[PDB]
Design a protein around this nucleic acid. Structure first.
Ligand SMILES: [Mg+2]
Length: 470
RNA sequence: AUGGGCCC
RNA sequence: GGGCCCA
């Protein structure tokens, strides 16, 4: 985005924190080029000539403004995508009752009961349960007041900046490249769900290449689906963006909301309005306050859906800006936020597409090696989606989601106090797909101390999940 | 944190 | 309810 104003106020928002990630019995064994991100400015692991607060916000490098010609072309692409999207989902996009938007609906999880409540409730130390009844699907007086102030479109708010406590590659840990989370107030989240939840749930249950969205998918079973689909194309591309989320420009964001969430598609008028409040945002960070124009907040309801939509639109816009006759089935793609796979029988030149993405302030680079240039001729067994490869399971013939061994080692090397056993069982469902030998090697540091699920027990579970028959 | 999926 | 992983 674009930082337009930075001011210091007395009302402090404390987030400091040491890490909650302790090394495991495996860190002494795997020695991963990974560690927890730095969360204090006096971290000994930091480089010389690095400040946390400067690198934290160093992603906001400007809000790319668009020409009339480019704005109108984005609007056609947004309309054309919306058209395909709504024809597959239906136009059954009526608002959610308060109850619905809390407890969820078929294909939309229930709101989180005990996650951060956001501002200004965080400064009053009032937990999320203090404001909403998550059993009965009703809201307290403070939320109904904001709710009525959202219908009337007067509602203001500030985002709360959290430093993300997670494992990062040491190169980035040392560079102070800690990722940030932007917590919106819990009433904003509820109202957004009211406005676009019925859309969101329908997105989820219809995930696939057809709507170009993997949000709602389950890699274990859905890998076979995605695999076979992309298998039948002459060209496949693993495209990386660089800070996809922050680089969404006002114009693109705004135009996307105007074309996708139209009342003619059955959306409440305030659907467009609620989503547009994400464009110009106030972020709170200890003493400082940052007014930003552009970019997506990570923490808004429907963040992944918005990113995926925008992604689907970016590819169309970029291709149409370079070629002629390009229509939705000139190509195929699936995305989950920034993460994307594109395919086509045509020989598209992504290298030439670079500057077209650049007009939306997006920088595309090949995922593959970061090799000098986008190449042609790649297949699905060459690419990565959601940190998983597409590999053929040697004994069911089905595609399986395989994670890089180095990644799995990193994961297994750190855990929060008293969460190790639990975590080992979870990670096991991810590691099974690496094969018996590699499954054994990965968990061997934990032998004799924790319960390790057998390879066999988890392969058998997977086979049933992917196909009830074989 | 938003969410998705999964695990108990 | 508590956890994990991915974006
Ligand atoms: Mg990828």
């Amino acid at each position: 985005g674009l930082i337009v104003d930075t001011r210091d106020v007395e009302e402090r928002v404390h987030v400091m924190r040491k890490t909650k990630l302790a090394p495991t019995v495996a860190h002494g064994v795997f020695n991963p080029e990974f560690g927890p991100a730095a969360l204090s400015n006096k971290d000994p692991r930091l480089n010389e000539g690095v400040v946390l607060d400067e690198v934290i916000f160093s992603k906001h490098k400007g809000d790319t403004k668009m020409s009339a010609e480019d704005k109108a072309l984005f609007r056609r692409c947004a309309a054309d995508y919306a058209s395909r999207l709504h024809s597959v989902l239906g136009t059954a996009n009526a608002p959610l009752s308060i109850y619905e938007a809390i407890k969820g609906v078929d294909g939309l999880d229930a709101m989180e009961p005990d996650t951060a409540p956001g501002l200004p409730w965080a400064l009053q130390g009032k937990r999320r349960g203090a404001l909403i009844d998550f059993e009965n699907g009703t809201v307290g007086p403070e939320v109904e007041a904001a709710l009525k102030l959202m219908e009337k479109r007067e509602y203001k708010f500030a985002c709360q900046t959290f430093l993300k406590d997670e494992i990062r590659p040491m190169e980035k840990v040392r560079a102070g490249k800690t990722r940030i989370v932007d917590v919106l107030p819990v009433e904003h989240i509820l109202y957004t769900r009211m406005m676009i939840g019925r859309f969101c749930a329908q997105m989820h249950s219809n995930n696939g290449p057809q709507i170009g969205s993997a949000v709602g998918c389950n890699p274990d079973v859905d890998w076979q689906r995605f695999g076979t689909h992309f298998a039948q194309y002459r060209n496949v591309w693993d495209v990386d963006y660089s800070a996809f989320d922050a680089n969404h420009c006002s114009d693109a964001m705004n135009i996307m909301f105007e074309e996708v969430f139209r009342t003619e598609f059955g959306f409440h008028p305030n659907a467009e309005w609620i989503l547009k409040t994400l464009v110009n945002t106030e972020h709170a960070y200890e003493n400082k306050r940052i007014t930003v124009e552009g970019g997506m907040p990570s923490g808004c309801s429907a963040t992944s859906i918005i990113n995926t939509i925008l992604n689907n639109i970016y590819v169309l816009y970029a291709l149409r800006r370079h070629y002629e006759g390009v229509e939705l089935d000139t190509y195929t793609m699936i995305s989950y936020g920034d993460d994307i796979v594109v395919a086509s029988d045509y020989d598209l030149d992504f290298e030439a597409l670079k500057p077209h993405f650049k007009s939306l302030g997006q920088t595309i680079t090949p995922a593959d090696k970061s090799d000098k240039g986008f190449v042609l001729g790649h297949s699905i067994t060459d690419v990565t989606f959601l940190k998983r490869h597409f590999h053929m399971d040697y004994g069911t013939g089905f595609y399986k989601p395989v994670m890089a061994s180095k990644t799995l080692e990193a994961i297994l090397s750190f855990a929060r106090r008293g969460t190790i056993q639990e975590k080992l069982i979870s990670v096991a469902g991810l590691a099974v797909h690496s094969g018996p030998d590699e499954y054994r090697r990965l968990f061997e540091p934990f032998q004799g101390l924790f319960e390790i699920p057998s390879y066999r027990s988890l392969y058998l579970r997977w086979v049933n999940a992917v196909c009830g028959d074989a």
